[PDB]
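Reopening: structure tokens for the protoporphyrin IX containing FE complex, inputs below.
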Amino acid sequence: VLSEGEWQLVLHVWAKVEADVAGHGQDILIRLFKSHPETLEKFDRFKHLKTEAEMKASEDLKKHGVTVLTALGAILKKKGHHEAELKPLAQSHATKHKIPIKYLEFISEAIIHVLHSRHPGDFGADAQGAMNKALELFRKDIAAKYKELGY
Ligand code: HEM
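Re-run output (same inputs, fresh job):
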């Protein structure tokens, strides 16, 4: 459970992310795909992309990055009271997209890295720790739904 102070650190940096949702989403998905190429293979939509320049040039990838970060922002703003948000996300990611929990760890790492690059003044160690806790809570709660469903 995050404290109120931890949530404030999380949402303070998140408010900065929302100034450029699409650029963050691009940076995060590209980092994910480059650092963990098995993740790109899960996207029939994107697996034709073979270089970072091609990824950066894809408007469709930029659009999907907005989709991802909009869903995550809605979750974070619930401050842990996110059952209604995680139900459909866990269902689609477990049963349709077939995404291991480990790949959610990978995207969490990419998120933290990009937030640190773009917002150092609002993403010192205290905020890094708080965002790590928020993304761990996300993963814990998704994992419980995966377990229910046999994934
Ligand atoms: C912060 C973590 C993530 C969030 C918030 C998120 C959110 C979303 C959302 C909102 C959608 C569209 C609706 C849906 O299908 O449920 C989506 C689609 C999808 N996601 Fe994620 N996602 C996350 C992590 C991942 C990861 C790590 C992968 C793969 C490694 C992945 C693979 C997919 C795929 C394959 C689709 C379908 C794309 C398409 O063909 O349109 N997601 N995601």
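Helices lie at 4-17, 21-35, 37-40, 52-57, 59-76, 83-96, 101-118, 125-149. The domain at 1-151 is CATH 1.10.490.10 (Globin-like). Marking as resolved unless the reporter disagrees.
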